[PDB]
Enzyme design. Structure first.
Site, mmCIF file in Angstrom:
data_model
loop_
_atom_site.group_PDB
_atom_site.id
_atom_site.type_symbol
_atom_site.label_atom_id
_atom_site.label_comp_id
_atom_site.label_asym_id
_atom_site.label_seq_id
_atom_site.Cartn_x
_atom_site.Cartn_y
_atom_site.Cartn_z
ATOM 1 N N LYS A 157 -19.978 -1.769 8.115
ATOM 2 C CA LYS A 157 -18.720 -2.471 8.203
ATOM 3 C C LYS A 157 -17.624 -1.454 8.436
ATOM 4 O O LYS A 157 -16.787 -1.632 9.323
ATOM 5 C CB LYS A 157 -18.439 -3.268 6.926
ATOM 6 C CG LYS A 157 -17.339 -4.312 7.114
ATOM 7 C CD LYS A 157 -17.082 -5.124 5.861
ATOM 8 C CE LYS A 157 -16.004 -6.155 6.126
ATOM 9 N NZ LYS A 157 -15.615 -6.869 4.883
ATOM 10 N N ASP A 158 -17.645 -0.373 7.659
ATOM 11 C CA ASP A 158 -16.628 0.662 7.784
ATOM 12 C C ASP A 158 -16.554 1.276 9.183
ATOM 13 O O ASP A 158 -15.465 1.388 9.752
ATOM 14 C CB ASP A 158 -16.843 1.723 6.711
ATOM 15 C CG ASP A 158 -16.411 1.239 5.330
ATOM 16 O OD1 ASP A 158 -16.509 2.018 4.361
ATOM 17 O OD2 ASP A 158 -15.966 0.076 5.209
ATOM 18 N N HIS B 298 -15.398 4.550 -9.050
ATOM 19 C CA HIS B 298 -16.828 4.342 -9.255
ATOM 20 C C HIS B 298 -17.217 4.006 -10.691
ATOM 21 O O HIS B 298 -18.309 3.516 -10.942
ATOM 22 C CB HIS B 298 -17.600 5.569 -8.790
ATOM 23 C CG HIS B 298 -17.595 5.750 -7.305
ATOM 24 N ND1 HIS B 298 -17.787 6.977 -6.702
ATOM 25 C CD2 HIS B 298 -17.418 4.863 -6.298
ATOM 26 C CE1 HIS B 298 -17.724 6.838 -5.388
ATOM 27 N NE2 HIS B 298 -17.501 5.564 -5.117
ATOM 28 N N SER C 82 -16.093 -1.407 -6.931
ATOM 29 C CA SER C 82 -15.083 -2.180 -6.232
ATOM 30 C C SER C 82 -14.813 -3.552 -6.850
ATOM 31 O O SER C 82 -15.703 -4.201 -7.416
ATOM 32 C CB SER C 82 -15.487 -2.372 -4.773
ATOM 33 O OG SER C 82 -15.650 -1.139 -4.106
HETATM 34 C C1 HEM Z 1 -5.144 9.594 0.535
HETATM 35 C C2 HEM Z 1 -4.872 8.238 -0.072
HETATM 36 C C3 HEM Z 1 -5.873 7.324 -0.425
HETATM 37 C C4 HEM Z 1 -7.199 7.234 0.003
HETATM 38 C C5 HEM Z 1 -7.943 8.046 1.061
HETATM 39 C C6 HEM Z 1 -7.785 6.137 -0.773
HETATM 40 C C7 HEM Z 1 -9.095 5.773 -0.704
HETATM 41 C C8 HEM Z 1 -9.685 4.789 -1.424
HETATM 42 C C9 HEM Z 1 -11.050 4.391 -1.228
HETATM 43 C C10 HEM Z 1 -12.074 5.057 -0.335
HETATM 44 C C11 HEM Z 1 -11.207 3.245 -1.918
HETATM 45 C C12 HEM Z 1 -12.414 2.326 -1.895
HETATM 46 C C13 HEM Z 1 -12.468 1.272 -0.788
HETATM 47 C C14 HEM Z 1 -11.294 0.314 -0.830
HETATM 48 O O1 HEM Z 1 -11.263 -0.545 -1.739
HETATM 49 O O2 HEM Z 1 -10.399 0.428 0.039
HETATM 50 C C15 HEM Z 1 -10.004 3.073 -2.684
HETATM 51 C C16 HEM Z 1 -9.835 2.097 -3.627
HETATM 52 C C17 HEM Z 1 -8.688 1.863 -4.371
HETATM 53 N N1 HEM Z 1 -7.519 2.593 -4.173
HETATM 54 FE FE1 HEM Z 1 -7.164 4.067 -2.910
HETATM 55 N N2 HEM Z 1 -6.859 5.528 -1.635
HETATM 56 C C18 HEM Z 1 -5.681 6.216 -1.398
HETATM 57 C C19 HEM Z 1 -4.498 5.901 -2.011
HETATM 58 C C20 HEM Z 1 -4.301 4.879 -2.883
HETATM 59 C C21 HEM Z 1 -2.994 4.299 -3.173
HETATM 60 C C22 HEM Z 1 -1.653 4.766 -2.628
HETATM 61 C C23 HEM Z 1 -3.194 3.283 -4.055
HETATM 62 C C24 HEM Z 1 -2.231 2.455 -4.646
HETATM 63 C C25 HEM Z 1 -0.967 2.932 -5.360
HETATM 64 C C26 HEM Z 1 -4.648 3.249 -4.260
HETATM 65 C C27 HEM Z 1 -5.301 2.378 -5.121
HETATM 66 C C28 HEM Z 1 -6.640 2.053 -5.083
HETATM 67 C C29 HEM Z 1 -7.253 1.009 -5.870
HETATM 68 C C30 HEM Z 1 -6.517 0.150 -6.886
HETATM 69 C C31 HEM Z 1 -8.530 0.840 -5.452
HETATM 70 C C32 HEM Z 1 -9.431 -0.324 -5.911
HETATM 71 C C33 HEM Z 1 -9.976 -1.146 -4.752
HETATM 72 C C34 HEM Z 1 -10.583 -2.463 -5.190
HETATM 73 O O3 HEM Z 1 -9.819 -3.426 -5.416
HETATM 74 O O4 HEM Z 1 -11.827 -2.538 -5.314
HETATM 75 N N3 HEM Z 1 -5.296 4.086 -3.375
HETATM 76 N N4 HEM Z 1 -9.040 3.988 -2.326
#
Ligand code: HEM
Ligand SMILES: CCCCCCCCCCCCCCCCCC(=O)OC[C@H](COP(=O)([O-])OCC(O)COP(=O)([O-])OC[C@@H](COC(=O)CCCCCCCCCCCCCCCCC)OC(=O)CCCCCCCCCCCCCCCCC)OC(=O)CCCCCCCCCCCCCCCCC
Ligand SMILES: CCCCCCCC/C=C\CCCCCCCC(=O)OC[C@H](COP(=O)(O)OCCN)OC(=O)CCCCCCC/C=C\CCCCCCCC
Ligand SMILES: CCCCCCCC/C=C\CCCCCCCC(=O)OC[C@H](COP(=O)(O)OCCN)OC(=O)CCCCCCC/C=C\CCCCCCCC
Ligand code: HEC
Ligand code: HEM
Ligand code: HEM
Ligand SMILES: CCCCCCCCCCCC(=O)OC[C@H](COP(=O)(O)OCC[N+](C)(C)C)OC(=O)CCCCCCCCCCC
Ligand SMILES: C/C=C(C)/C=C/C=C/[C@H](OC)[C@@H](C)[C@@H](OC)[C@@H](C)CCc1oc2c(O)c(OC)cc(OC)c2c(=O)c1C
Lengths: 67, 98, 49, 109, 379, 101, 241, 59, 79
Positions: free
Chosen positions: E227-228, E201, E205
């Protein structure tokens, strides 16, 4: 007294193209192995190719005859 | 104070006292005919006792003992060349060798 | 000048009942809204189930 | 931009915002110490608790004895169990005084 | 005041992150996994608690308690299925989540990415200990192998294994501490997820085009809430179809056999979501190397950010990068395939290649092609 | 020679950011240097870049692209920022070398 | 050896995602388990009550139950003792422990059939093919004394002798007790045994798909609706002149 | 005009809307559940204990 | 917390939109929708398919090859 549709169909199936050639291939193996003393080979492979082809066939209609 | 509390708590994880330390096990070399290996429960993980035919006994004494990861001679490993006894646990990551 | 500004044409998207620029869109409103809200109501019923 | 990394960092900005630069009355007395003790009790219970849960067995036929084993066989299991049992009490001791203070000084407002 | 949506100490938060949260107007479906991942976590925790209510951490009772749960507890079978399959959809989703991040350069949001890695790693450990709970053949031997991985550490190592088992071999002390550990971790995941979103945040995004979207943001609600929800329902069908129609599809049948401390099944393969790594580790015919390779196969995610050489943020406009990307995806798909196959030819060599392949596309090709592409842009 | 010169034109069409109406410079990732550059841009250029971007974002959400007739042509791409960016980076390097001095 | 014969795929009446189990055949299989298999195989996770409303009437189940003497106690003097079976009891273990079982089977240990179809790749297709697939070893293959040949069993030398043959029992429903007929019924039973929910599991799946369709649709319309505002959105750059 | 009547009388007022969803589910549930089972039992005739039942029942 | 209002500086951009109730949720399904679905499909299939198609083969080969090595070589017992 009774007749297991399993045998009835296993016969019918062995008439089949593949089986026949497989069955034949097997007989051949069996023959030379059963003869050749102090050997090292086996006829598992042929038995399987045969079985595989046979039963595959069996399992295609056997159940129709079962309840 | 800290070092001691951590010490104690850290060791609350280690093996407990009910974790004994038991003895031997006798095995009749007759239940194990030549050319066969048999596993027996023991000190937890398996225990092998294999009756080696000399058909193998040779190979095992006839190999580059210099080209071994853990260099040893089949002789200084066992006692009776027709019997081989070892703990059936892969030294890699612990599975039971088949 | 702001006098040279026009709202583009939205016929490619307009609902058949409000396509004619000379008909009170109001008469078809209750349906346009009744329908969409029905979808929603239904979704609620499904989820509720 | 933010000069120090104590007031800018998304996480530290928080530890600093509630445990370092947090403005506090100059006169709060000992009756204001229970809030943190309460917090420390919570932490201590959870911790000793996890430690105990590692040797417990939720089963009528084994529960009682597993606890006994914890105390009798697990290294320092007796100590941990004691701290957990007595922690519970100091948790209430502290919570009760915390509540008292609140009532006496009108914190309930 | 005025509205109680922006003032209230608590609502100010729900509104601040799920209602008035500004979001790019163009984020695609590849942005739906964040919440699905969140929903998985919630779903797992919930069915998990339900199951934990009927479980018994004891070698002599674990296996049967699970059986009783399925056979005697009302809907116990369903709950266990949703829990078992949820684990998979958790990995399915997490994997796509990771992919999206690599393809669109989300990793440039370092803290969000790093914590993301911690999440993956924790999810991994969590799912591991969890699987050890029914105490079937796979549970036991998996436990035996994975914990044993640490023996690879010089001097100490073993000493760490002792802890992991609470003994000198996998046994009850291990089962009970694992049940605890499994009960605990999900929450450390939920917790870290809060830190994840918090760092996210800070920036908001990212989006497909990889260019600033300040010129066009939209309230999370109703655009992405809607959408979600749609996204969830789409993931839900296969998950339930699988759960209700082919329950054990994604699961090994070898784990219907109570753990036998004296017999490792002849055919023992890691849960599908671990295969790729499993494969990489089998390739190095050395204990320590294989472990290091394994460690590296996942830890490498931390480097991705420092391997970004492109002058552009996403691969939307980088055709060469795009191919290298899909190559990598297939590379893994290959490693997974290999993982399911016995240590024999041609499998062994193929595996070793794919493995060698994998680390190369990440450490060398990508940064290289990125530099190359920059020059082609006349930059 | 005129090799990468045509290679470039190929890549430019392969990348495809022009199907959105963007110039090479529009797609630049906004790191520190770029943000500083964007700041120096005369207003018209800045307002234009904005619109181009905002339109592209709208195109993306729509899952559409401009009609082939509006795609930017390789030779009509204006590197409106390139130079500013050069200076910015040039300026920074100096400070840097100077501060280590 | 390093070669194995995978079984074929029989068209079980319950194979289909909406296809329930044939309870009649499951009733039959039970008998086969009871009167034939139970002599060496334990089915620890099933109880006579489980039959009720599935394959047998409550009375029938109670009956089947009482046919077995069960050990209970201690009593007033702290003595164990026998007693009739209750519908609450589980199917009787043929042996008090694997050591005993092995002892009575050439050292071979008959596995508990409760979760058998799911404990083996192939399930009923495999169990069925095995039960009927017995035969003589091919040329060059010597089956150690005690073990019998079966190409379907891994290693081909199993420790179990052909448990079934024509008329090894008599289905009280009048079904011709042919060997394969038997195998088909007991396998069908072994499926239910491993997962009684089977039928309900599938009935739910049906409802699930229906709702999932209706709902995914209504939500696709809803997502679109709200988004239209943006999809059709038109914009223009009108700088000052 | 159902859409008009529906809107006008159910979907307009946030209250009536809610009550309509409650009422809806209720009727929908009965309907769905019955029909679903019907479809299932039909696709599985003579195989369910429902079907076999009578052979070992009373009279 | 609040971001809407700072974001960026924008000038001279007019936009026009209609209430969701004045338009269609899914319009021009053929004259516009599908045509683009294809457009998109078309433009990416040559980037995606290759590595997968490739791995696909590698699968079949390695699989078949492993299986081939199962069968026996008659030349081993023709003695
Ligand atoms: C319990 C595990 C995880 C949950 C529930 C989670 C959840 C989220 C949520 C809710 C978002 C925002 C919506 C979206 O862009 O999909 C997000 C964004 C993001 N997450 Fe995760 N995430 C998890 C694990 C990880 C992992 C394993 C990575 C990568 C090593 C990661 C990297 C990121 C990044 C880089 C964003 C930026 C999205 C964008 O490009 O705007 N997340 N994550
Ligand atoms: C419903 C499927 C969408 C149908 C379609 O292809 O739309 C084309 C078309 C819309 O065309 P369009 O305006 O160019 O497309 C805009 C978006 O693609 C319109 O799509 P969207 O952005 O609104 O939604 C995309 C959606 C759709 O995802 C798909 O593409 C499928 O994906 C998601 O929301 C993400 C969730 C993914 C769940 C997967 C879970 C993993 C489990 C793996 C096992 O709709 C129709 O022709 C009518 C279909 C009725
Ligand atoms: C690890 C073990 C996991 C085993 C492998 C599981 C993967 C399953 C198969 C792959 C699933 C992906 C389906 C293919 C989708 C095809 C598609 O739509 O691609 C084109 C599309 C077009 O992009 P734009 O240029 O922005 O378009 C705008 C202009 N119109 O590209 C994308 O969708 C972006 C990439 C999506 C990510 C999918 C990656 C799948 C997961 C793999 C994990 C990889 C990361 C590393 C993991 C380390 C541990
Ligand atoms: C016996 C039968 C069972 C009984 C069920 C109990 C009855 C439940 C009563 C629910 C009352 C619903 C009232 C909603 C009113 C709120 C409102 O203002 O409208 C809906 C409001 C939006 O406003 P509009 O529709 O645009 O316009 C308003 C009209 N003037 O909220 C919405 O967006 C509704 C969308 C609902 C669908 C979202 C959930 C879908 C989720 C997917 C997975 C589902 C399955 C699993 C769930 C199980 C959970 C453990
Ligand atoms: C005389 C005792 C006896 C009877 C009665 C018998 N079995 Fe077995 N069964 C065994 C033994 C012994 C084995 C173990 C073989 C081995 O693993 O070497 C076995 C193994 C099995 C296995 C397969 C084990 C594997 O690894 O594939 C199944 C399945 C099985 N029996 C099914 C049945 C069924 C169904 C019936 C009744 C139709 C039955 N058996 C009756 C003794 C018996
Ligand atoms: C709110 C903090 C906690 C309170 C107030 C608390 C209180 C208690 C109490 C009063 C008992 C009985 C003690 C006795 O034996 O006399 C107990 C036992 C126990 N608690 Fe907790 N507990 C807390 C946290 C935890 C947590 C978080 C865990 C582990 C996840 C835990 C695990 C256990 C276990 C294993 C026992 C049973 C064995 C024993 O009695 O030592 N507790 N706890
Ligand atoms: C990070 C989320 C979670 C994941 C990834 C997860 C994963 C798993 C896995 C893979 C298993 C083995 C499934 C099987 O039987 O095949 C399992 C079992 C289990 N989990 Fe979890 N779990 C999660 C959360 C929880 C939580 C929070 C609890 C309860 C506090 C829980 C309780 C259990 C129980 C009781 C079992 C053992 C019995 C069984 O296998 O059903 N899990 N979990
Ligand atoms: C504030 C006061 C703290 C004093 C602690 C200390 O430093 O006290 C010393 C003791 C360590 O005893 P020992 O040296 O292992 O005894 C030797 C006996 N042998 C030789 C037989 C092995 O610590 C404790 O268990 C105190 C537990 C404190 C609980 C912490 C809260 C959570
Ligand atoms: C007390 C808690 C502890 C000790 C936690 C440990 C966490 C470790 C890692 O998580 C970070 C670990 C899960 C992760 O490694 C990166 C996996 C990808 C490793 C996958 C893995 O699985 C196997 C498996 O499942 C098996 O059974 C079905 C059998 C196995 O070989 C015989 C393996 C195996 O050889 C490997 C490498």
């Amino acid at each position: 007294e009774l007749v297991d549709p399993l045998t009835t169909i296993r016969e019918h199936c062995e008439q089949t193209e593949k089986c026949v050639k497989a069955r034949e291939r097997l007989e051949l193996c069996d023959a030379r192995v059963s003869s050749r003393s102090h050997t090292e080979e086996q006829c598992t492979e042929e038995l399987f190719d045969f079985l595989h082809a046979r039963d595959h066939c069996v399992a295609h209609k056997l159940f129709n005859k079962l309840k | 104070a800290a070092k001691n509390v951590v010490t104690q708590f850290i060791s609350s994880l280690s093996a407990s006292a009910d974790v004994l330390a038991l003895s031997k096990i006798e095995i009749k070399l007759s239940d194990i005919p030549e050319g066969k290996n048999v596993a027996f429960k023991w000190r937890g993980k398996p225990l092998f006792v294999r009756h080696r035919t000399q058909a193998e006994i040779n190979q095992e004494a006839e190999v580059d003992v210099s080209k071994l990861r853990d260099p040893q001679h089949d002789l200084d490993r066992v006692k009776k060349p027709e019997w081989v006894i070892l703990v059936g646990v892969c030294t890699h990551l612990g599975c039971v060798p088949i | 000048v702001h006098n040279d500004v026009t709202v583009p044409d939205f016929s490619a998207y307009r609902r058949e009942d409000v396509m004619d620029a000379t008909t009170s869109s109001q008469t078809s409103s209750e349906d346009r809204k009744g329908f969409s809200y029905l979808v929603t109501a239904t979704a609620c019923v499904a989820t509720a189930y | 931009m933010a000069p120090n990394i104590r007031k800018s960092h998304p996480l530290l900005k928080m530890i600093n915002n509630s445990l370092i630069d947090l403005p506090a009355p100059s006169n709060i007395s000992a009756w204001w110490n229970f809030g943190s003790l309460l917090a420390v009790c919570l932490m201590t219970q959870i911790l000793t608790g996890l430690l105990l849960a590692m040797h417990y067995t939720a089963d009528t036929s084994l529960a009682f004895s597993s606890v006994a084993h914890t105390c009798r066989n697990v290294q320092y299991g007796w100590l941990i169990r004691n701290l957990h049992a007595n922690g519970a009490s100091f948790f209430f001791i502290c919570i009760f005084l915390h509540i008292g203070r609140g009532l006496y000084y009108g914190s309930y407002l | 005041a005025p509205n109680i949506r922006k003032s209230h100490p608590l609502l100010k938060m729900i509104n601040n992150s799920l209602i008035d949260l500004p979001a790019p107007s163009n984020i695609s479906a590849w942005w739906n996994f964040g919440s699905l991942l969140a929903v998985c976590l919630m779903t797992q925790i919930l069915t998990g608690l339900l199951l934990a209510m009927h479980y018994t951490a004891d070698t002599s009772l674990a296996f049967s308690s699970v059986a009783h749960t399925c056979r005697n507890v009302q809907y116990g079978w369903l709950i266990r299925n949703l829990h078992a399959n949820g684990a998979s959809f958790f990995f399915i989703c997490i994997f796509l989540h990771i992919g999206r991040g690599l393809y669109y350069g989300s990793y440039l949001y370092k803290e969000t990415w790093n914590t993301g890695v911690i999440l993956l790693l924790t999810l991994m450990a969590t799912a591991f200990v969890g699987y050890v709970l029914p105490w079937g053949q796979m549970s036991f031997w998996g436990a035996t192998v994975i914990t044993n991985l640490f023996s690879a550490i010089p001097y100490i190592g073993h000493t760490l294994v002792e802890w992991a088992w609470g003994g000198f071999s996998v046994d009850n002390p291990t089962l009970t501490r694992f049940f605890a550990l499994h009960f605990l971790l999900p929450f450390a995941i939920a917790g870290i997820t809060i830190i994840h979103l918090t760092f996210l945040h800070e920036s908001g995004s990212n989006n497909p085009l990889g260019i600033s979207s300040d010129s066009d943001k939209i309230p999370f609600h109703p655009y992405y809430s809607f959408k979600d929800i749609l996204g969830l329902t789409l993931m839900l069908t296969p998950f339930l179809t699988l759960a209700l129609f082919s329950p054990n599809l994604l699961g090994d049948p070898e784990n219907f056999t109570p753990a036998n401390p004296l017999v490792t099944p002849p055919h023992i393969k890691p849960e599908w979501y671990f295969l790729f790594a499993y494969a990489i580790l089998r390739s190095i015919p050395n204990k320590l190397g294989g472990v290091l390779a394994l460690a590296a196969s996942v830890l490498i995610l931390f480097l991705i950010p420092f391997l970004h050489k492109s002058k552009q943020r996403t691969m939307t406009f980088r055709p060469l990068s795009q191919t290298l990307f899909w190559l990598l995806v297939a590379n893994l798909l290959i490693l997974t395939w290999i993982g399911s196959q016995p240590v024999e030819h041609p499998f062994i060599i193929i595996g070793q290649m794919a493995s060698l392949s994998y680390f190369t596309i990440l450490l060398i090709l990508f940064p290289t092609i990125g530099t190359l592409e920059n020059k082609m842009l006349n930059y | 020679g005129r090799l990468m010169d045509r290679i470039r034109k190929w890549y430019y069409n392969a990348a495809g950011f022009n199907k959105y109406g963007l110039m090479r410079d529009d797609t630049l990732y906004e790191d520190d240097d770029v943000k500083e550059a964007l700041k120096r841009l005369p207003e018209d250029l800045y307002n234009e870049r904005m619109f181009r971007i905002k339109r592209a974002l709208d195109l993306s959400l729509k899952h559409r692209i401009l009609p082939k007739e509006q795609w930017v042509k390789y030779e009509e791409d204006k590197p409106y920022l390139e130079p500013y960016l050069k200076e910015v980076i040039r300026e920074r390097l100096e400070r840097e070398a100077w501060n280590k001095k | 050896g390093e070669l194995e014969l995978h079984p074929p795929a029989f068209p079980w009446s319950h194979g289909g995602p909406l296809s329930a189990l044939d309870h009649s055949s499951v009733r039959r299989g039970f008998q086969v388990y009871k009167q034939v298999c139970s002599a060496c195989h334990s089915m620890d996770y099933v109880a006579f009550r489980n039959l009720i409303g599935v394959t047998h009437t409550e009375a029938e189940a109670k009956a089947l139950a009482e046919e077995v003497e069960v050990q209970d106690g201690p009593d007033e003097n702290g003595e164990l003792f026998m007693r009739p079976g209750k519908i609450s009891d589980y199917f009787p273990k043929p042996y008090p422990n694997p050591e005993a079982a092995r002892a009575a089977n050439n050292g071979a240990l008959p596995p508990d059939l409760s979760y058998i179809v799911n404990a083996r790749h192939g399930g009923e297709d495999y169990v069925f093919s095995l039960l009927t697939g017995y035969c003589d070893p091919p040329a060059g293959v010597v089956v150690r004394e005690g073990l019998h040949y079966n190409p379907y069993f891994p290693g081909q030398a199993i420790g179990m002798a052909p448990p079934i043959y024509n008329e090894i029992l008599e289905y009280d429903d009048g079904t011709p007790a042919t060997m394969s007929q038997i195998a088909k019924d007991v396998c069908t039973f072994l499926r239910w045994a491993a997962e009684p929910e089977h039928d309900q599991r599938k009935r739910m799946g049906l409802k699930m798909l229906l709702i999932s369709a209706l709902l995914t649709s209504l939500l696709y319309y809803m997502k679109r609706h709200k988004w239209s505002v943006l999809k059709s959105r038109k914009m223009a750059y009108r700088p000052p002149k | 005009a159902l859409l008009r009547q529906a809107y006008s009388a159910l979907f307009r007022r946030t209250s009536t809307f809610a009550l309509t969803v409650v009422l809806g589910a209720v009727l929908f549930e009965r309907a769905f559940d019955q029909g679903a089972d019907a479809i299932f039992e039909h696709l599985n005739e003579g195989k369910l204990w429902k079907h076999i039942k009578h052979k070992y029942e009373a009279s | 917390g609040i971001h809407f209002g700072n974001l960026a500086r924008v000038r001279h951009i007019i936009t026009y939109s209609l209430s969701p109730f004045e338009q269609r949720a899914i319009p021009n399904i053929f004259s516009d929708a599908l045509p683009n679905v294809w457009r998109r499909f078309s433009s990416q299939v040559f980037k995606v398919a290759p590595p997968f198609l490739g791995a696909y083969l590698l699968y079949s080969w390695g699989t078949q090859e492993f299986e081939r090595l199962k069968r026996k070589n008659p030349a081993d017992y023709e003695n």
